[PDB]
Design an enzyme around this catalytic site. Structure first.
Site, PDB file in Angstrom:
ATOM      1  CD  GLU A 147     -11.913  14.505  -1.946  1.00  0.00           C
ATOM      2  OE1 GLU A 147     -12.099  13.247  -2.730  1.00  0.00           O
ATOM      3  OE2 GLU A 147     -12.005  14.411  -1.687  1.00  0.00           O
ATOM      4  CG  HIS A 148     -14.733  14.975   1.050  1.00  0.00           C
ATOM      5  ND1 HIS A 148     -13.396  15.623   1.918  1.00  0.00           N
ATOM      6  CD2 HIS A 148     -13.802  14.022   0.763  1.00  0.00           C
ATOM      7  CE1 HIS A 148     -13.054  15.078   2.445  1.00  0.00           C
ATOM      8  NE2 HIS A 148     -12.311  13.894   2.012  1.00  0.00           N
ATOM      9  CD  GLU A 205      23.598   3.259   5.828  1.00  0.00           C
ATOM     10  OE1 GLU A 205      24.296   2.211   5.209  1.00  0.00           O
ATOM     11  OE2 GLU A 205      22.999   3.555   5.638  1.00  0.00           O
ATOM     12  N   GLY A 218      18.566  12.973   2.605  1.00  0.00           N
ATOM     13  CA  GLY A 218      18.490  14.190   1.473  1.00  0.00           C
ATOM     14  C   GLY A 218      17.840  13.680   0.058  1.00  0.00           C
ATOM     15  NE  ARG A 231      -2.865  -5.880  -2.801  1.00  0.00           N
ATOM     16  CZ  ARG A 231      -2.457  -5.542  -1.757  1.00  0.00           C
ATOM     17  NH1 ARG A 231      -2.996  -4.438  -1.077  1.00  0.00           N
ATOM     18  NH2 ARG A 231      -1.964  -5.952  -1.037  1.00  0.00           N
ATOM     19  CE  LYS A 274      -2.758 -22.323  -3.267  1.00  0.00           C
ATOM     20  NZ  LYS A 274      -4.212 -21.724  -2.889  1.00  0.00           N
ATOM     21  CG  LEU A 324      12.273 -19.509  -2.560  1.00  0.00           C
ATOM     22  CD1 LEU A 324      12.326 -19.215  -3.638  1.00  0.00           C
ATOM     23  CD2 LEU A 324      13.691 -20.076  -1.515  1.00  0.00           C
TER      24      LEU A 324
END
Length: 949
Positions: A66-67, A296, A316, A384, A851, A855
Site C-alpha cells: 500500500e506504500h 465515579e 479498563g 467532519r 460568524k 454557541l
C-alpha cells in the site's frame, strides 16, 4: 462486478444527507454518499485485510504494498500523476493497512468525480512497482519502523501482537524495515515485485473490499458513474484472515512483563482474551462494562483509590480483537503508593468484581445509559466527513446496508446471559499482566529485536493467586444511584415579540444584572452560561488569595465525584480563579440546568472541610509554587507582562512567605466573611425562556441570601484598576538575569489610547503589517532566534503590542535590530502600495469578520466586553466602519507623535529578561534602571474611562 440494490436509508432525520448502501457481487461493499450541499466530494476504498495477513516470508508486505500501490499505471506510469491531479484540485489523500483493514481514501475539489475516478481506478490492471520507488519506499518503511521505536503505544501494541502464541500467526510483524522486507525475501529466491503482483492479484483483488464515494450530483448520476468503472475488480476468493482460536493459550494467564518504555511512565496493562461479541452487538456489553469500570460514584474504586491517592488515572475497557477472538484491556497510571501496592489494586479490581457479583445484572443503568446515548446519537450535531467515511467503511464490513449508522449506537435487548458470561469471563484465572515502568533498567535483559524493549516472563507466585481467588471480601463498595433528570425537554423555543439582536439588560436591581439572547445560528438543545463573582478580598492579600485559590481547588475537587456522570452526560461547567474573584461558567444541554445549577449554588454555598485533605492540597500547591521559580523566559516574561501592567499583583515570593502561617480555622472562619457581600451578573444563552430566566436569577440570588445573607454590593465599591501613564516621552526599562536558561528575553509594549474608533484598527492593522513582512524579515531573513513572536496585548481594557521573542543576544543590540525594523517601516510607509493596502485590509477584515461556529465562540468575546463593561455588541460593526476609514495619510499621522523616537506622545515599554549569565544608530535617550518597582509605579498618572454608551 456491476450490480446494485438499495433503498431509503435510515438517515437520522436531523441530517439531510441522502444515502444508499450496497455490495457488489465480487465482494465489494459499496456505500454511496449523496450530499449535494457539500463542497469537497470525497471517496474511500477499504479492503478488510490485516497487517498480519502477509505471507510469512515477507513481514509488512501489505504495508509496503500500500506504500507502493500508488506507483505506475498503463494509462499514466508517471510517479505523482494522480497526485498531480489532486495537486490541481486541493486534495489531501491518505491510506493505510490496519490490523484488520487495508484502506485508501481521498477527496476532490467540487465536482471532479469521474476525473479523480479515472485517475484513481487504474491501480488494478498494471501495477508497475518501480525499482527506485521500491528502494526509497523501503527506506520510508524503515523510517516508519523507526518512528514506531519511539511511540510507546505501538510498541505495546506490537508487544501484544508478538508475545502471544508464537506459532500462531497473530505473532507476525506489521511495519517492516529494510532487512526483513527486502534483504531476506529476495535472497531466498522469492523476488519481491513478482510476489507483489501475486499479492495484489490473487489475494487483494479476490474479496473483502468495503468502499464508499461521497457524491454530490444525484443518486443515478453517481450510480452509473462509479458502478460502471468498478467492474474492473473480479473475485478470486481468498480464504478469510481469521484466528478462531485465541492466542493466549495457557502460557499467558497470570504472566508478568516488566516493560521499559520511552517516557518515564508507570502503567499496568491487564489483558483478557474475550470471545467474539460482534454477534452480540445488539447488547453492547463491553463498553457498557467499561462505563461501569471508569465510573465515579458512591463506592467508586476510583473514589477509593484517589481518596487513597494511590492512582494517577486508569481505564479498563474492551479492545477490538480479530475475527475469531476479541480482547479486553485495563490500563492505569500509577503512584508510588500505587507502585508498592499494585497487587492490592488488582485485589480492589477483584472486590469490584465481587460488588458486581452482589448486584448481578441491572437493567436500569443500561436502560438510562442506552436512552441517553440514543437521544444523544440522534442529537449529535454534525461531522467532519473525511475520516467519517473511513469510520463507516470500517463498520460497513461488519453490517448490512441499513445496520451501519445506528449499528452499535442503537441497542435493542437486555442480555443478562452475556453479562454473566463476561462476569464469568473476567476472573483472576483470566489475567495477563503487562507492567510498564522506566525504573525497569538492567534486571530486564531479554530485549526486543524489532524495537529494543526489555521484558521478563517472571510469573506470579501462587500464594498471591490463591490469596486472591478465595478472598472475595469487599469493603466500602456501594451502589451508584442514577441521575438522569429528563433531557427529553429539548423542543426548540421560538423567539418572542421581544426580538432584539443581542443579550439585553432584562433584569436590574441593586443585586440583579441579567443578560440573555437565545440561539439563532444553531437552534441547539444546549445552553451556555456566564456568571460574575466579585469580592474585594480577592485583590487584597497574597494570603487570602492562596486561601481562596485552594478553596476553589478542594471545592471543585469535591463535587466532581458527583458531577462525573452529569458532565459525562454532556454538561460542562467551569470554576476559575480570577483577580476579581472566582469565575463561573456552565455549558451544555437542557437536561438538568436549573436543577443542578441550584445544586451547585447550594453546594458551594455551604461546604465542609477535612483537615488532612486540606493540608495535602496545601502542600501540593506549596510544592507547585517553588516549581514556578524556573519558568521559560517567555513564560516568565508573560508573568512580568501581567506583573508590570497592573495596580498590584502579589508575587510568588509574596505568596511564599504567606503560606508559612496558614491554619484551617483561619480561612474556615474567614470564608463567610469572605463571601459576605457580592453582586453576580449573569450572562445566559440558548434554548430557554425569558420568564424562566427571571425566575432562575431570582432563585439563585434568593438562595444565596438564604445561605448567608450576602447583601448587595455598592456602586461606591465596585472598582476597576488603571494602566499607568508614562511621562509622555519617558520610556523606562529594567533587566532580569535568569538562573537556568541562557537565553535573554525581551518584550515590547505600547499604549495608543482606549478602544476608540481609530485605535483598534490602528493596532490591529499595524500588527498585521508587522506580521507578514516582519515574519519575512526578522525571524526568517535575519534569524535572530527561534522564539520570535509579534502580536497584540490587551491590558486594563487597553490594547497594545507585544513581542514574545526569546534568543541569546545582547538585548540592546536586539533593540537596535528592532530600531532597524522601525526604519524599515519608515521606508515602507510610502512603499505600502495600493495592492499591499487592499490585500492587507481585506485579510484583516476576514480576520475580523466571522460568524459563530459554536454557541460559546462569540460568548467568550462577549464576556470580554462584559469584563470590560462595554456591551456594544455591534462595536465590531463600528470596527468595520473604521476599517472603511483608514487612509495612507493616517499612518504618517500615526507615526509622528505616536510611533517615532522624537514622538512627543510616545508610550513605549520594554523589559530585559537577561540570560543565565548575560546600519544607522539614532540618538536614543538613555533610559533608566528600575530598582524600586514600588517607587517606580508610585508616582505616575493613570488613564480615563468611558464616556458611556
Amino acid at each position: 462486478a456491476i450490480k446494485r440494490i438499495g433503498n431509503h436509508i435510515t438517515k437520522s432525520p436531523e441530517d439531510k444527507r441522502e444515502y444508499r448502501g450496497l455490495e457488489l457481487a465480487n465482494g465489494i461493499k459499496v456505500l454511496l454518499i449523496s450530499d449535494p450541499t457539500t463542497d469537497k466530494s470525497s471517496a474511500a476504498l477499504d479492503v478488510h485485510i490485516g497487517s498480519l495477513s502477509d505471507p510469512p516470508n515477507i513481514a509488512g508486505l501489505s504495508h509496503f504494498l500500500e506504500h507502493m500501490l500508488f506507483l505506475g499505471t498503463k494509462k499514466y506510469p508517471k510517479e505523482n500523476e494522480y497526485s498531480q491531479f489532486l495537486s490541481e484540485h486541493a486534495g489531501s489523500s491518505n491510506a493505510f493497512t490496519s490490523g484488520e483493514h487495508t484502506n485508501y481514501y481521498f477527496d476532490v475539489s467540487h465536482e471532479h468525480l469521474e476525473g479523480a475516478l479515472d485517475r484513481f481506478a487504474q491501480f488494478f490492471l498494471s501495477p508497475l512497482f518501480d525499482e527506485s520507488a521500491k528502494d526509497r519506499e523501503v527506506n520510508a518503511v524503515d523510517s516508519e519502523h523507526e518512528k514506531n521505536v519511539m511511540n510507546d503505544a505501538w510498541r505495546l501494541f506490537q508487544l501484544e501482537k508478538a508475545t502471544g502464541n508464537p506459532k500462531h500467526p497473530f505473532s507476525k510483524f506489521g511495519t517492516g524495515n529494510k532487512y526483513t522486507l527486502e534483504t531476506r525475501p529476495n535472497q531466498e529466491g522469492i523476488d519481491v515485485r513478482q510476489e507483489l503482483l501475486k499479492f495484489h492479484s490473487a489475494y487483494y483483488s479476490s474479496n473483502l473490499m468495503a468502499v464508499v464515494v461521497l457524491g454530490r450530483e444525484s443518486l443515478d448520476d453517481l450510480t452509473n458513474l462509479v458502478v460502471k468503472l468498478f467492474s474492473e475488480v473480479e473475485n478470486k476468493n481468498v480464504p478469510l484472515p481469521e484466528f478462531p482460536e485465541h492466542p493466549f493459550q495457557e502460557e499467558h494467564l497470570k504472566q508478568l512483563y516488566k516493560i521499559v518504555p520511552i517516557k518515564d511512565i508507570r502503567n499496568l496493562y491487564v489483558t483478557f482474551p474475550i470471545p467474539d461479541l460482534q454477534k452480540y452487538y445488539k447488547s453492547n456489553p463491553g463498553h457498557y462494562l467499561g462505563h461501569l469500570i471508569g465510573h465515579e460514584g458512591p463506592g467508586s474504586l476510583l473514589s477509593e483509590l484517589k481518596s487513597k491517592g494511590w492512582v494517577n488515572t486508569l481505564v479498563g475497557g474492551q479492545k477490538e480483537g480479530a475475527r475469531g477472538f476479541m480482547f479486553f484491556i485495563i490500563n492505569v497510571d500509577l503512584t508510588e503508593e500505587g507502585l508498592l501496592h499494585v497487587e492490592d489494586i488488582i485485589l480492589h479490581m477483584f472486590q469490584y468484581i465481587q460488588k458486581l457479583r452482589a448486584e448481578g445484572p441491572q437493567e436500569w443503568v443500561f436502560q438510562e445509559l442506552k436512552d441517553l446515548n440514543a437521544v444523544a446519537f440522534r442529537f449529535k450535531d454534525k461531522e467532519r466527513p473525511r475520516g467519517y467515511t473511513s469510520k463507516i467503511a470500517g463498520i460497513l464490513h461488519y453490517y448490512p446496508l441499513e445496520e451501519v449508522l445506528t449499528a452499535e449506537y442503537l441497542l435493542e435487548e437486555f442480555r443478562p446471559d452475556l453479562i454473566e458470561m463476561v462476569l464469568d469471563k473476567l476472573r483472576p484465572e483470566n489475567v495477563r499482566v503487562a507492567i510498564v515502568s522506566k525504573s525497569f533498567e538492567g534486571k530486564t535483559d531479554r530485549t526486543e529485536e524489532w524495537y529494543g524493549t526489555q521484558y521478563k516472563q517472571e510469573a506470579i507466585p501462587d500464594e498471591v493467586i490463591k490469596k486472591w481467588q478465595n478472598a472475595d471480601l469487599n469493603g466500602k463498595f456501594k451502589l451508584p444511584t442514577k441521575n438522569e433528570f429528563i433531557p427529553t425537554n429539548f423542543e426548540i423555543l421560538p423567539l418572542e415579540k421581544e426580538a432584539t439582536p443581542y443579550p439585553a439588560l432584562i433584569k436590574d436591581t441593586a443585586m440583579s444584572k441579567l443578560w440573555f439572547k437565545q440561539d439563532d445560528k444553531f437552534f441547539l438543545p444546549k445552553a451556555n452560561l456566564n456568571f460574575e463573582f466579585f469580592s474585594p478580598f480577592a485583590y487584597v492579600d497574597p494570603l487570602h488569595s492562596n486561601m481562596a485559590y485552594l478553596y476553589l481547588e478542594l471545592l471543585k475537587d469535591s463535587l466532581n465525584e458527583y458531577a462525573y456522570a452529569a458532565e459525562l452526560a454532556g454538561l460542562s461547567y467551569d470554576l476559575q480563579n480570577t483577580i476579581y474573584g472566582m469565575y463561573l461558567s456552565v455549558k451544555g444541554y437542557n437536561d438538568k440546568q436549573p436543577i443542578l445549577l441550584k445544586k451547585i449554588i447550594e453546594k458551594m454555598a455551604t461546604f465542609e472541610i477535612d483537615e488532612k485533605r486540606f493540608e495535602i492540597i496545601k502542600e501540593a500547591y506549596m510544592r507547585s509554587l517553588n516549581n514556578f521559580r524556573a519558568e521559560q523566559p517567555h513564560q516568565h516574561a508573560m508573568y512580568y507582562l501581567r506583573l508590570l501592567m497592573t495596580e498590584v499583583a502579589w508575587t510568588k515570593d509574596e505568596l511564599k512567605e504567606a503560606l508559612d502561617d496558614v491554619t484551617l480555622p483561619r480561612l474556615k472562619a474567614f470564608i463567610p466573611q469572605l463571601l459576605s457581600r457580592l453582586h453576580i451578573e449573569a450572562l445566559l444563552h440558548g434554548n430557554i425562556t425569558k420568564q424562566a430566566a427571571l425566575g432562575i436569577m431570582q432563585m439563585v440570588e434568593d438562595t444565596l441570601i438564604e445561605h448567608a445573607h450576602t447583601k448587595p454590593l455598592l456602586p461606591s465599591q465596585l472598582v476597576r484598576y488603571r494602566e499607568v501613564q508614562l511621562p509622555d516621552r519617558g520610556w523606562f526599562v529594567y533587566q532580569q538575569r535568569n538562573e537556568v536558561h541562557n537565553n535573554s528575553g525581551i518584550e515590547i509594549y505600547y499604549q495608543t489610547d482606549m478602544q476608540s474608533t481609530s485605535e483598534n484598527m490602528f493596532l490591529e492593522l499595524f500588527a498585521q503589517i508587522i506580521s507578514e513582512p516582519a515574519f519575512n524579515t526578522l525571524r526568517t531573513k535575519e534569524q535572530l532566534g527561534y522564539i520570535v513572536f509579534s502580536g497584540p496585548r490587551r491590558a486594563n481594557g487597553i490594547q497594545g503590542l507585544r513581542f514574545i521573542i526569546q534568543s541569546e543576544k545582547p538585548p540592546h543590540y536586539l533593540e537596535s535590530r528592532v530600531e532597524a525594523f522601525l526604519i524599515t517601516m519608515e521606508k515602507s510607509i510610502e512603499d505600502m502600495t495600493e495592492e499591499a493596502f487592499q490585500k492587507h485590509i481585506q485579510a484583516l477584515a476576514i480576520r475580523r469578520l466571522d460568524k459563530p461556529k459554536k454557541l460559546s465562540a462569540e460568548s467568550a468575546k462577549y464576556w470580554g466586553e462584559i469584563i470590560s463593561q462595554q456591551y456594544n455588541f455591534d462595536r465590531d460593526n463600528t470596527e468595520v466602519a473604521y476599517l472603511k476609514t483608514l487612509t495612507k495619510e493616517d499612518i504618517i499621522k500615526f507615526y509622528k507623535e505616536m510611533l517615532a523616537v522624537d514622538a512627543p506622545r510616545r508610550h513605549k515599554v520594554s523589559v530585559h529578561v537577561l540570560a543565565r549569565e548575560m546600519s544607522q544608530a539614532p540618538a536614543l535617550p538613555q533610559p533608566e534602571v528600575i530598582q524600586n518597582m514600588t517607587e517606580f509605579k508610585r508616582g505616575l498618572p493613570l488613564f480615563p474611562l468611558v464616556k458611556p454608551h
